[PDB]
């Protein structure tokens, strides 16, 4: 299935790895991968099949009290769909800029370029700046000095967001998806371009340095909480778990297949292509270090812009750079567009199933899809302004990643493992797929996953360190509060639902608890 490769792999993993110093990210990344990553991904898919309904309705058949998990999930996809599409706007802008005789980021001789620029080759023939980096910052981004200075709304980027959103609306409205012969090209094209990029990176005259930085752990980094949540939550983000889409995916259709084998096959492959595409990014960074005569830790931005700094450099050192630059962004667009369709479609399905009486009562569903895209487009405008990067960084860290995913993951395992009961869950899976989860799955939900999620959460709070764009910009206090509001918007679902249903139920307290703990309500 195409949704198990995406911008989480080719854009999110390399930047987080680079931000956390590289090889020290891989220790907590693998620990969560098997400890919680795969076991939770199997858990969600079973829930969807077991009920054969949306991510919100299923919990009614498992533990009515904790139905808020479904609400917590649907809000997460709503926030994710707002800022994830912004990456397609940057790719769209790059693609149009690629339709030129010479790529603008190859050299710095234009009006938007600083007087401090020095070409990489001549930089080692001061506080010089590479043309590639400042093209991203000044031309594509026009970075503001801080989040407190929104600046002007970039009209060019606003049109790019409109173009991608329009494509999403028509595709969703008309149900356009890869089902025919085009599936071979759509699925194969990401891996074909990534192999060429990977080969280009390794063959660079300084690839070796980058791959050592990528793989050798600085174990003194593991004494900081940041790398544990960043690594652990990246597993949840990249698997699209805790979003409720996987529950909807299972309910859509599943039969005559071993779900256990499929989930491990999908989950190992999704993680493999992140690790594999890590070499490509770091290999390029290694070469940029020696060419620029600076540390590998400082060559590029320690943020979402890494993918828009490294890969554009790689395409510049290939025969006919324009040809490969075009192919890259029509692979960053198609790989990200298919993902956007799945989560926009899932969000629409999740929302209509709550109020089918009015929205799903007729043709209003078409109007609802336009409304969802419209409001999302307006929300995305905040991240298109000159200071939009700080908003985008804030959204990525908090809106649909970080503690919020841990919050959802902990309750999902806890409810099934202890409240619903592990034995009953294993009993269900026996009926569905014929064999029990086994000790690895049973203990992971019961012990490993709750402990890891809880441990990271406490370890963060005890050793709290505030978010910072790149590695030098400190967010203001109000900005941090806004970020926590986005994360709390999903976490607060579970407690809010619990109290609402405890109040909306008749009888003494204990009767209400017993009634809402028993499934099938």
């Amino acid at each position, epitope marked *: 299935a195409g949704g198990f490769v995406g911008l989480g792999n080719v854009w999110r993993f390399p930047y987080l790895c680079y931000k956390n110093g590289g090889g020290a990210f891989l220790i907590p990344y693998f620990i969560f991968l098997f400890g919680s990553g795969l076991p939770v991904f199997f858990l969600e898919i079973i829930i969807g099949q077991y009920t054969s309904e949306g991510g919100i309705t299923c919990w009614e058949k498992i533990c009515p009290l904790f139905s808020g998990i479904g609400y917590a999930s649907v809000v997460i996809v709503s926030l994710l769909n707002v800022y994830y599409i912004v990456i397609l706007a940057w790719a769209t802008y790059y693609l149009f800029q690629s339709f030129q005789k010479e790529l603008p980021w190859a050299h710095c001789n234009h009006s938007w370029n600083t007087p401090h620029c020095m070409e990489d080759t001549m930089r080692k023939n001061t506080n010089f700046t590479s043309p590639v980096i400042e093209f991203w910052e000044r031309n594509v981004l026009s970075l503001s000095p801080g989040i407190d200075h929104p600046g002007s709304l970039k009209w060019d980027l606003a049109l790019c967001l409109l173009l991608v959103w329009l494509v999403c609306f028509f595709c969703i409205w008309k149900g356009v998806r890869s089902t025919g012969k085009v599936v071979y090209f759509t699925a194969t094209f990401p891996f074909a371009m990534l192999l060429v990029l990977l080969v280009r990176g390794l063959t660079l005259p300084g690839a070796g340095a980058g791959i050592k930085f990528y793989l050798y752990p600085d174990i003194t980094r593991l004494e900081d909480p940041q790398v544990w949540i960043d690594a652990g939550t990246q597993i949840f983000f990249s698997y699209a778990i805790c979003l409720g889409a996987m529950t909807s995916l299972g309910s859509y259709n599943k039969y005559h297949n071993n779900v256990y084998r499929d989930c491990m096959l999908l989950g190992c492959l999704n993680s493999g292509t992140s690790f594999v595409s890590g070499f490509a990014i770091f290999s390029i960074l290694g070469f940029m270090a020696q060419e620029q005569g600076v540390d590998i830790a400082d060559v590029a931005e320690s943020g979402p812009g890494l993918a828009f700094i490294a890969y554009p450099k790689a395409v510049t050192m290939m025969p006919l750079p324009t040809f490969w630059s075009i192919l890259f962004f029509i692979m960053l667009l198609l790989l990200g567009l298919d993902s956007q369709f799945v989560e926009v479609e899932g969000q629409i399905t999740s929302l209509v199933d709550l109020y089918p009486s009015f929205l799903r009562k007729g043709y209003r569903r078409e109007i609802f899809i336009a409304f969802v895209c419209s409001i999302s487009y307006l929300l995305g405008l905040t991240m298109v302004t000159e200071g939009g990067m700080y908003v985008f960084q804030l959204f990525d860290y908090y809106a649909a990643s970080g503690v919020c995913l841990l919050w959802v993951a902990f309750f999902e395992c806890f409810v099934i493992a202890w409240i619903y009961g592990g034995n*009953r869950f*294993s009993e269900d899976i026996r009926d569905m797929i014929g064999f029990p989860p086994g000790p690895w799955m049973k203990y992971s939900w019961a012990v490993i996953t709750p402990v890891l999620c809880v441990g990271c959460f406490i370890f963060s709070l005890v050793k709290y360190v505030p978010l910072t764009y790149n590695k030098t910009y400190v967010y203001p206090n109000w900005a941090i509060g806004l970020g926590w509001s986005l994360a709390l918007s999903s976490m607060l679902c579970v407690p809010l639902v619990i109290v609402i249903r405890l109040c909306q139920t008749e009888g003494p307290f204990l009767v209400r608890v017993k009634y809402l703990l028993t499934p099938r309500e």
Partner: antibody
Amino acid sequence: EVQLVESGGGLVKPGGSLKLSCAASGFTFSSYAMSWVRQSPEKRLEWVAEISSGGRYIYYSDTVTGRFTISRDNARNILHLEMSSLRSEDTAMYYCARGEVRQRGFDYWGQGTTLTVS
Amino acid sequence: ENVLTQSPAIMSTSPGEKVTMTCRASSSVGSSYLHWYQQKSGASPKLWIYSTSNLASGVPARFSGSGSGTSYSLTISSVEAEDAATYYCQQFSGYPLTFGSGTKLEM
């Protein structure tokens, strides 16, 4: 898993009722699904019913869907099969088998008890 | 019910000679959901082959299994004196479980 032993077999008449039992030992009876298999005097094997590990899912053969009731006692580690409308064709030897994993089949079989409805 | 039919009900065999019995299903059966059981005269059946290719704990490597979809069979490299027994094919894909007619090796 070492021992599975059936008991309770005997002679009855048409339209009668009987309760078959199968004690289990050597393994955690609660965590393994149990099934009943029937072997007619012609040596033909016929499936009767199966009960999940926890007893929440119970299934019956078409011939005994509305006549036989399957139950288990996890605390006592004993498997029970109840017949209420035994017919003339119900005479056979009954075996209790462990069927936890569908992809692996019945790992172990009991000694079995003969039932006749003469 | 997913009726399972075994063609060679009776197979007279001499020691050393290889034999093979074919089990046919009236409906689609998964590869992992078909198993073979051996039953010796006056004894309860014992699992022999599962997943259509995997040998049980006690069955020697002498036996092997093959098949998929709607036709399944197992073969014996060299029938020994201890191989004289009745073999039944069973399907687990559908829940109204059905056992094959059974093929009895009389020698």
